Amino acid sequence: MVQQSEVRQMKHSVSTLNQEMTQLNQETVKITQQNRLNAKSSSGVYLLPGAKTPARLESQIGTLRMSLVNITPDADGTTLTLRIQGESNDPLPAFSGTVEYGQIQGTIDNFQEINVQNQLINAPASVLAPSDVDIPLQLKGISVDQLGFVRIHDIQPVMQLEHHHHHH
């Protein structure tokens, strides 16, 4: 019932608004957008190519932190360096992940993920502590200038053995 006949007819009458705050650095704005969307995400973390900031994700192998650097155009899509940094002090075993990437045409109040598809980021077995890895993420179809968001999710260990949870 919010559908009211509300008109924007510019009438010549003075109206004093509240003291609107100052402007902000463009990158910092995209960072503020990243953080807000990050919390609004239930499937992994939002890495906005315009923010390039590191995001913390609690995976099956452990708590890791990804970020986007060296973002450059590709033959088909866009090549950027996907860095997996360990938040813990432990080495991270071999794992694969499903990364979504597309465009955001809406606002923070209401945004639609359009032109979005995914790719498999498979990193090697990190036998070093602390664990830090960098792998080339060759995005397809989408152009660097047209990049809206790169969301890392679905992180799973590959072909590695478990330890028998002997409780009985």
With respect to residue 54, please indicate whether it lies within any of the assigned structural domains.
yes
Taking CA 95 as the corner, what is the angle to CA 94 and CA 96, rounded to the nearest 5 degrees?
A: 145
Q: Give me the number of domains the chain comprises.
A: 1
Q: What is the DSSP string of 70-131?
A: EEEE-SSSEEEEEEEEESSSSPPPPEEEEEEEEEE-S-SSS--EEEEEEEEEEE----SSS-
What's 45's domain CATH number? Answer: 2.60.40.1620
Residue 4 CA to residue 59 CA, distance in Å, equals 47
With respect to residue 11, please indicate whether it lies within any of the assigned structural domains.
no
Residue 147 CA to residue 150 CA, distance in Å, equals 8
Task: Count other Cβ atoms within 10 Å, centred on residue 126.
Answer: 20
CA distances from residue 109 to 1, 46, 114, 124 in whole angstroms, order as listed: 19, 16, 16, 39
With respect to residue 79, please indicate whether it lies within any of the assigned structural domains.
yes
Range of the domain at 113: 24-158
